[PDB]
């Protein structure tokens, strides 16, 4: 036949907020819907990320607490430390961020001390509001992991006295779709990915395919390892 | 027969961590939340002087209001136990500098 | 994060002759449903082979499925009997033909008859007909090669009975998902594959053949040649 | 399995098991794949899983099975019947008898 | 595993449709229609907010 | 909301001192120098929330304890432990503690 | 009314029924028969299984 197509990955159409369109141009006329489904189902379930897993505010003992001059309660601050999109580097795997101010306005996500390796993606994410001038300090802990599901999870052991546990959403992908187009003797797979910002579309989709191939590679031998 | 039990079942609804309006409503959720004493209501025309999650201090505009104290202080309920073991909690809406009226939440 | 999970427990079981049940257990949650769909759809519709695609009987004189032919079977039994032959075409031929012209005195007909073209290798000896020795009976079927499932837009055009083209050889897959655990995690999967070929290949070599065909579409994107190493 | 007040069964499918079985066994007159000729349940399955044939299309199927009758004897059911794609997809669960 | 719309949006809940005509509470269906309407009206605004705010 | 009371029983007054007899020393960590938990600790099912002690005498254990109590030389307890514990299954964090002490004393 | 829900559904860019095409999350092929999707407001009653 000599009609062996092997698809190549591309990044047509960078659109929207954090929305893109990956594309796999030469596909072998039947194998495209399989790849669309496997990509959509592995992106939305197996990708790893980083998030805040524990916080320690200074003059605060528990979560059902309150600070002076601050317009929020700790239950509402720990709720904003969940929308902070962080981007770790290669082999850190764990670290403690630090925040400390003495201003009199909206504290933001941009106010974390500049650690190397960390990078906050959404910088105008409100964290707290100080209505009068005062000193506001907290230490968030960042970790890597994936959404392993509700029951099985990590209990997030606490060490100091004011430690509060935050439950993280590690996956960076928010919404996937796909489509398949006809070319004649080949087809075009077209993926739509929407991320939070801490990963790029090509790297994401090739990580998905790496996972899927490592899964498929057990049926080529019918052997355990 | 079903309205009977749809009315009876929204008196058993546990309130949630973060509240959220109905997108389809009747125009009566405001009346039921106001004609109970859970929302804080301003008694005088003023403008917010200080705010946190424990109190609110209004600065009464005395030219259009009565001979009031020149200052209204409203204190806020925070993590209070309910008859059903649930949680009652008040959160401020206003910002320092806002022009409020009589009746406003 | 924490090192995605692999099966480690495979169980094969040949219940019928060309039919087998596989079991792979301790797949991470929701993965059995993406492996099963992929394997099923690539095994049933993206393997290559040969198949009978057209049948014309009395050089085109038999038109309806309700025409009398000199044998015990009807026209429909003949068409369904021939259609289920597992022919196989040689490495450089595009088409074939199997003619069955038979007359004489009341025998029982197998595929031991049927002069084959250059390349065709019918490969088994299925029953065809019971001839009633009367008039002459002409039967010739057209053979082809390809990939997929080419449906037939018409059932009988002008001279031949147009059939559906399959080419796959694998007849039935049917995966199914069950529960498992590796200790405290209790939401994992167990996949059950139920493959059934037509003889031209065994099931353990249609699995191995759909798997690598899936992997080979991911070579300009992934480095599979070391991914395999374990 | 049966009621003690009557003889009627108590494990009869009820609400949305009845709707699925009712849906696939109806039939549409001019449908896509109408009149084809299959020889098995594996055939109708494989042809249906490809998206090329309807589930309400009239087909012809070849059966060959044993059927016990009232006296207890066991005759042989053979031939080519006029069916629907959906009914013939249920032929896999029927037991012998 | 949830059904999803064409653009990828998953679904929140699935509710059997059989219960509706036997217990004749149709406002439950008109509410879902008027909720689709308002969800669409509110994405018509989020579209404009990300372009020339 | 759980409650523990310090009675004035006949055979001996009930005191809320932390000196719980024969209680495991590890379980003596989450309690302050008084015998009450700290506001903000994470308590589990089966932990002490308040430590109250009342007296108890006249043990008179059976001969089974008399044949195996001479290998450790158990001490005598003039006091008992009416110390509040958390119920079963429950957990959470303490957010408030209130004390009302002896009237007119 | 219903004329009004239809007018608003048009302005939102939907069909004048609550019905749209959905996709099987497990394979990716659609269902036949457009499904009714919408935004019902749902409650959670004090009948939790933890205390039962």
DSSP calls for B48-71: EEEE-SSEEEE---TTTS-S--S-
One domain, residues A177 and A189: yes
Report the domain count for chain A.
2
| Partner-chain contact A217 C1, CB within 8 Å | no
Among A88, A83, A131, smallest CA distance to A107 is for A131
* Resolution value (Å, 1 decimal): 3.0
Is residue E28 packed enough to be buried (19+ CB in 10 Å), middle (13-18) or exposed (0-12)?
A: middle
| Partner-chain contact F40 A158, CB within 8 Å | no
Domain that includes residue A193, residue range: 1-48+171-225
Q: List for chain E the helix, strand, coil content (%; round to 5).
A: 50, 5, 45
> Hey, where are the domains in chain C?
1-48+168-230, 49-167
One domain, residues A41 and A61: no
One domain, residues A29 and A55: no
Nearest CA in chain D to C43: D46
Q: What is the largest CA-CA distance in chain B?
A: 55
Work out whether the CA dihedral D35, D40, D43, D44 comes out positive or negative.
positive
Q: CA-CA distance, E16 to F29, in Å (whole number)?
A: 53
Query: Is residue B30 helix, strand or coil?
Result: helix
One domain, residues A94 and A199: no
Of A129, A154, A170, the domain-final residue: A170
| Partner-chain contact A194 E8, CB within 8 Å | yes
Which chains share 3+ C-beta pairs under 8 angstroms with D? Answer: C, E
Experimental method: cryo-EM
One domain, residues A81 and A101: yes
One domain, residues A128 and A219: no
User: Are there at least 3 beta-carbon pairs closer than 8 Å between A and G?
Assistant: yes
Query: Is residue A171 helix, strand or coil?
Result: coil
Partners of C171 on chain D (C-beta within 8 Å) are 42, 46
For the beta carbon of residue C161, count every other beta carbon within 10 angstroms. Answer: 25
Among A193, A170, A202, A208, smallest CA distance to A82 is for A170
Among C191, C225, C88, C198, smallest CA distance to C144 is for C88
Chain position carrying tokens 């002076």: A68
Task: Please list, in sequence order, all residues whose beta carbon lies within 8 angstroms of the beta carbon of residue B63, skipping any fewer than 6 positions away.
Answer: none
Nearest CA in chain E to D14: E18
| Pairing assessment for the beta strands D37-38 and D58-68 based on DSSP bridges | parallel
One domain, residues A202 and A116: no
User: Are there at least 3 beta-carbon pairs closer than 8 Å between B and E?
Assistant: yes
Partner D contacted by C79 (CB < 8 A)? yes
Chain position carrying tokens 């600790």: F41
Partners of E34 on chain B (C-beta within 8 Å) are 24
One domain, residues A34 and A107: no
- How many alpha carbons lie under 13 Å from residue B12 in its C-beta half-sphere? 10
Among C9, C29, C8, C10, smallest CA distance to C179 is for C29
One domain, residues A87 and A147: yes
> Could you tell me if C131 and C105 are in contact, meaning their C-beta atoms sit under 8 angstroms apart?
no
C25: its two tokens? 């257990």
Query: Is residue A182 helix, strand or coil?
Result: strand
User: Are there at least 3 beta-carbon pairs closer than 8 Å between F and C?
Assistant: no
Interface test with G, best of C32, C34, C35, C37 (most G CBs within 10 A): C37
How distant is the Cα of A67 from the closest Cα of chain C, in angstroms? 35
Partners of E16 on chain D (C-beta within 8 Å) are 16
One domain, residues A101 and A148: yes
Task: Please list, in sequence order, all residues whose beta carbon lies within 8 angstroms of the beta carbon of residue E51, skipping any fewer than 6 positions away.
Answer: none
Partners of D15 on chain E (C-beta within 8 Å) are 18
Nearest CA in chain B to E31: B24
For the beta carbon of residue G3, count every other beta carbon within 10 angstroms. Answer: 8
| Pairing assessment for the beta strands C140-147 and C96-99 based on DSSP bridges | antiparallel
Partner E contacted by A150 (CB < 8 A)? no
Of A125, A153, A170, the domain-final residue: A170
> Could you tell me if C196 and C19 are in contact, meaning their C-beta atoms sit under 8 angstroms apart?
yes
Among C36, C37, G34, A41, smallest CA distance to E6 is for G34
Is residue B44 packed enough to be buried (19+ CB in 10 Å), middle (13-18) or exposed (0-12)?
A: buried
One domain, residues A126 and A225: no
Of A127, A147, A170, the domain-final residue: A170
- CA separation (Å) from C25 to B5, C4, C34, C182, C192? 47, 14, 14, 10, 9
> Could you tell me if A111 and A186 are in contact, meaning their C-beta atoms sit under 8 angstroms apart?
no
Q: CA-CA distance, A212 to A41, in Å (whole number)?
A: 10
Q: CA-CA distance, D36 to D57, in Å (whole number)?
A: 9
Backbone phi, then psi, for B100, in 5-degree steps? Answer: -110, 160
One domain, residues A37 and A130: no
> Could you tell me if A159 and A54 are in contact, meaning their C-beta atoms sit under 8 angstroms apart?
no
> Could you tell me if C218 and A9 are in contact, meaning their C-beta atoms sit under 8 angstroms apart?
no
Partner E contacted by B4 (CB < 8 A)? no
| Partner-chain contact E25 B24, CB within 8 Å | no
Q: CA-CA distance, C53 to C65, in Å (whole number)?
A: 17
Beta strands in B4-105 (DSSP E): 46-51, 55-58, 72-75, 80-81, 87-88, 99-100
Name which of A64, A68, A79 is nearest B52 (Cβ-Cβ): A68
- How many alpha carbons lie under 13 Å from residue D26 in its C-beta half-sphere? 7
Partners of E28 on chain G (C-beta within 8 Å) are 40
DSSP run (H or E) holding C41: helix C32-45
The number of C-beta contacts closer than 8 angstroms across A and C is 126
> Could you tell me if A170 and A181 are in contact, meaning their C-beta atoms sit under 8 angstroms apart?
no
How distant is the Cα of E21 from the closest Cα of chain D, in angstroms? 13
The helix-helix angle for G2-12 and E27-49 (nearest 10°) equals 30
> Could you tell me if A54 and A140 are in contact, meaning their C-beta atoms sit under 8 angstroms apart?
yes
Q: CA-CA distance, A189 to A3, in Å (whole number)?
A: 18
Partners of E33 on chain G (C-beta within 8 Å) are 5, 9, 17-18, 36, 38
Query: Is residue E35 helix, strand or coil?
Result: helix
Q: CA-CA distance, A64 to B77, in Å (whole number)?
A: 12
């Amino acid at each position: 036949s000599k009609l062996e197509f092997v698809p190549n990955i591309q990044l047509k159409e960078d659109l929207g907020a954090f929305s893109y369109k990956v594309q796999l141009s030469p596909v072998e006329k039947g194998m495209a819907h399989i790849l669309g489904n496997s990509i959509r189902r592995v992106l939305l379930s197996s990708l790893s990320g980083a998030s805040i897993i524990k916080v320690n505010i200074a003059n605060v003992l528990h979560e059902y607490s309150t600070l002076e001059d601050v317009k929020e309660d700790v239950v509402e601050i720990v709720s904003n430390l969940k929308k902070v999109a962080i981007k770790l580097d290669t082999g850190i795997d764990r670290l403690d961020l630090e925040l400390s101010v003495n201003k009199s306005g909206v504290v933001s996500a941009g106010d974390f001390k500049t650690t190397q390796g960390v990078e906050i993606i959404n910088k105008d994410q409100p964290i707290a509001t100080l209505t009068n001038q005062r000193a506001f300090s907290l230490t968030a802990t960042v970790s890597v992991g994936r959404n392993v599901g509700i029951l099985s999870a990590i209990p997030t052991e606490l060490e100091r006295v004011g430690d509060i546990a935050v439950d993280a959403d590690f996956n960076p992908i928010k919404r996937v779709a796909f489509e398949v187009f006809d070319n004649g003797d080949s087809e075009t797979l077209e993926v739509f990915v929407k991320t939070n910002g801490t990963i790029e579309p090509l790297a994401a989709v090739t990580k998905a395919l790496e996972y899927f191939c490592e899964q498929i590679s057990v049926f080529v031998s019918l052997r355990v390892p | 027969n079903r309205v009977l039990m749809g009315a009876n079942m929204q008196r058993q609804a546990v309130p949630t961590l973060k509240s959220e309006k109905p997108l389809v409503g009747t125009g009566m959720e405001k009346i039921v939340a106001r004609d109970s004493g859970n929302c804080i209501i301003a008694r005088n025309v003023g403008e917010v002087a200080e705010v946190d999650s424990n109190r609110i201090v209004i600065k009464v505009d005395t030219e259009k209001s009565q001979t009031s104290n020149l200052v209204d202080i409203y204190s806020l309920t925070k993590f209070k136990r309910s008859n059903k073991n649930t949680c009652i909690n008040q959160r401020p809406i206003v910002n320092v500098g806002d022009k409020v009226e009589a009746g406003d939440i | 994060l924490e090192n995605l999970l692999h099966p480690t427990n495979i169980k094969i079981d040949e219940y019928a002759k060309n039919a087998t049940k596989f079991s792979f257990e301790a797949l991470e949650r929701g993965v059995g449903y993406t492996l099963g769909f992929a394997l099923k759809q690539t095994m049933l519709y993206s393997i290559a082979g040969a198949c009978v695609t057209s049948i014309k009987i009395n050089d085109g004189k038999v038109t309806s499925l309700e025409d009398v032919i000199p044998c015990d079977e009807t026209v429909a039994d003949i068409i369904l009997n021939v259609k289920s032959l597992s022919v196989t075409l040689a490495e450089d031929v595009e088409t074939g033909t199997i003619t069955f012209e038979l007359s004489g005195s009341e025998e029982e007909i197998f595929s031991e008859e049927a002069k084959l073209s250059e390349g065709l290798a019918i490969t088994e000896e299925v029953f065809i007909c019971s001839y009633n020795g009367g008039k002459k009976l002409k039967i010739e079927a057209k053979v082809e090669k390809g990939v997929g499932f080419r449906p037939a837009q018409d059932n009988f055009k002008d001279g031949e009975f147009l059939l559906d083209a399959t080419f796959s050889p694998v007849v039935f897959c049917d995966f199914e998902i069950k529960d498992a655990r590796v200790g405290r995690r209790t939401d994992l999967d167990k996949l059950e594959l139920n493959i059934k070929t037509n003889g031209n290949v065994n099931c353990e070599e249609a699995l191995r053949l759909a798997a690598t065909k899936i992997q080979n579409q991911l070579r300009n994107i992934v480095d599979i040649e070391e991914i395999n190493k374990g | 399995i049966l009621s003690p007040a009557s003889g009627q069964p108590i494990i009869t499918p009820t609400q949305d098991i009845v709707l699925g079985l009712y849906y696939i066994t109806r039939e549409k007159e001019g449908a896509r794949g109408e009149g084809k000729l299959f020889s098995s349940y594996e055939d109708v399955s494989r042809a249906y899983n490809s998206g090329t044939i309807d589930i309400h299309a009239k087909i012809k199927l070849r059966i060959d099975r044993q059927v016990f009758d009232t006296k207890g004897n066991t005759y042989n059911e053979k031939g080519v019947v006029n069916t629907t794609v959906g009914r013939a997809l249920l032929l896999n669960i029927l037991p012998e008898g | 595993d949830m059904p999803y719309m064409e653009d990828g949006t998953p679904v929140d809940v699935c509710l059997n449709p059989l219960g509706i005509p036997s217990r004749m509470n149709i406002g439950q269906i008109l509410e879902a229609h008027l909720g689709l309407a308002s969800y669409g009206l509110g994405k018509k605004i989020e579209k404009t907010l990300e372009k020339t705010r | 909301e759980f409650t523990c009371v310090a009675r004035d029983t006949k055979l001996g007054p009930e005191e809320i001192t932390a000196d719980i007899p024969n209680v495991s020393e590890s379980s003596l960590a989450k309690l302050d120098e008084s015998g009450i938990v700290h506001i903000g600790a994470n308590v589990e099912a089966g932990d002490i929330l308040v430590a109250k002690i009342t007296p108890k005498a006249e043990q008179q254990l059976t001969p089974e304890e008399r044949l195996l109590r001479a290998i450790f030389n158990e001490k005598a307890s003039n006091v008992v432990d009416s110390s509040l514990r958390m119920p079963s299954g429950t957990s959470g964090t303490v957010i408030n503690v209130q004390v009302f002490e002896n009237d007119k004393g | 009314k219903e004329e009004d829900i239809k007018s608003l559904l048009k302005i939102g860019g939907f069909a004048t029924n609550g019905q749209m095409k959905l996709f099987d999350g497990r394979t990716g092929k659609p269902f036949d028969r457009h499904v009714t999707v919408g935004y019902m407001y749902m409650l959670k009653l004090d009948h939790l299984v933890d205390d039962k």
